[PDB]
Curated annotation (Swiss-Prot), chain A:
Entry keyword set: Disulfide bond, Evasion of host immunity by viral interleukin-like protein, Glycoprotein, Host-virus interaction, Secreted, Signal, Viral immunoevasion
Coiled coil: none
Name the record gives this protein: ORF8 protein
Species per Swiss-Prot/TrEMBL record: Severe acute respiratory syndrome coronavirus 2
Biological role: Plays a role in modulating the host immune response. May act as a secreted virokine by mimicking interleukin-17A (IL17A), and thereby binding to the IL17RA receptor, leading to activation of the IL17 pathway and increased secretion of pro-inflammatory factors. Contributes to the cytokine storm during SARS-CoV-2 infection when secreted by unconventional pathway. May act by down-regulating major histocompability complex class I (MHC-I) at cell surface. May inhibit expression of some members of the IFN-stimulated gene (ISG) family including hosts IGF2BP1/ZBP1, MX1 and MX2, and DHX58.
Subcellular localization: Secreted
Effect of residue 59 to D: Complete loss of hIL-17RC binding
GO molecular function, one term: cytokine activity
Subunit structure, interactors included: Homodimer. Interacts with host IL17RA. Interacts with host IL17RC. Interacts with host MHC-I.
Swiss-Prot/TrEMBL GO biological process terms: negative regulation of interferon-beta production; positive regulation of immunoglobulin mediated immune response; symbiont-mediated perturbation of host defense response; symbiont-mediated suppression of host anti-inflammatory cytokine signaling; symbiont-mediated suppression of host antigen processing and presentation of peptide antigen via MHC class I
Amino acid sequence: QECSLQSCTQHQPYVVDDPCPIHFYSKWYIRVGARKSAPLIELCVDEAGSKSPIQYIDIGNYTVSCLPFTINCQEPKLGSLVVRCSFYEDFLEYHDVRVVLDFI
Amino acid sequence: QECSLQSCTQHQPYVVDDPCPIHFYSKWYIRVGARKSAPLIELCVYTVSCLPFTINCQEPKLGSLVVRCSFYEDFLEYHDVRVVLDFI
Ligand code: NA
Ligand code: NA
Ligand code: NA
Ligand code: NA
């Protein structure tokens, strides 16, 4: 279980520091209620060869961009922010990192 | 800046894993709010037991569990670790 502690100014945009190896793959999620037996919601979806923030689940004014992943600095009300890291597009083997924010 | 991710069943007792290096002293706090500079309320001096430190598995409503780690007993040179809970 790994944990990335980052700092930003609450309610201003923040480009999240990618805790995954940068030349490989990552996918950003919210884990509902930070409960591992609850759903894992992808924050970004592919539309036209590009990633854009999900629109079919309402998580408010949280995700600003998916290129690169940028949030409005806040803890998401819905749950925890989790990134899944993988060397491979198939994502069959991976590890997760939870990202937590101190407000500056 | 460091956080420790741990897992427990929400609202049931959890013996917290030491987030400090072996041999280091540890003191436990609830942080008042969400800023790094915020004052801390020391525990033991939500809490199920103080030996070993055992909590009711939950995020405190005031703020995060923080552990202060210090090699020397005088706690002059220290580092704090925020404990973050995933719920099972
Ligand atoms: Na990285
Ligand atoms: Na969180
Ligand atoms: Na997969
Ligand atoms: Na630290």
